[PDB]
Amino acid sequence: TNPPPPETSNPNKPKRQTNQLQYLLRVVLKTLWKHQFAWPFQQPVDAVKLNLPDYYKIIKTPMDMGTIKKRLENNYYWNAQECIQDFNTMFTNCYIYNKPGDDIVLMAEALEKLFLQKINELPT
Ligand SMILES: Cc1nnc2n1-c1ccc(-c3ccc(N)nc3)cc1N(c1ccc(Cl)cc1)C[C@H]2C
Known part of the structure; x- marks a missing residue:
């Protein structure tokens, strides 16, 4: 079957707004979301719908852009590197x-290449 999705909000976690987190939501996520190839990555892999029974036998740290959007917009991440790590996990899972x-x-x-170009521009 499918696991529950990754956790995306937790009111016990401390919250801060940073320039880098703001950029990652308002610029980075937005440009990836509207890319020609974004659609497979916009929501958790539904292994039941797609008849991929071994997907969650192989992929033990699931991630998708839907989840990353929820984490940014709910202030789940404290450090911008957490978000960058999640995008990396998403691409690496696919590989x-x-x-x-x-x-x-x-x-x-090709999505990763665009993410890398966008992260090059991350404000201080
Ligand atoms: C992400 C990712 N990593 N691996 C996979 N995927 C993947 C996720 C979702 C889909 C998908 C497929 C159909 C649909 N209606 N909505 C989503 C297809 C995928 N896959 C996919 C998407 C596009 C193309 Cl051209 C081929 C395979 C294959 C699947 C094993």
């Missing part, structure tokens, strides 16, 4: 589950 040169791998690679 782990799939194989070099698969269509979805090319799409993730």
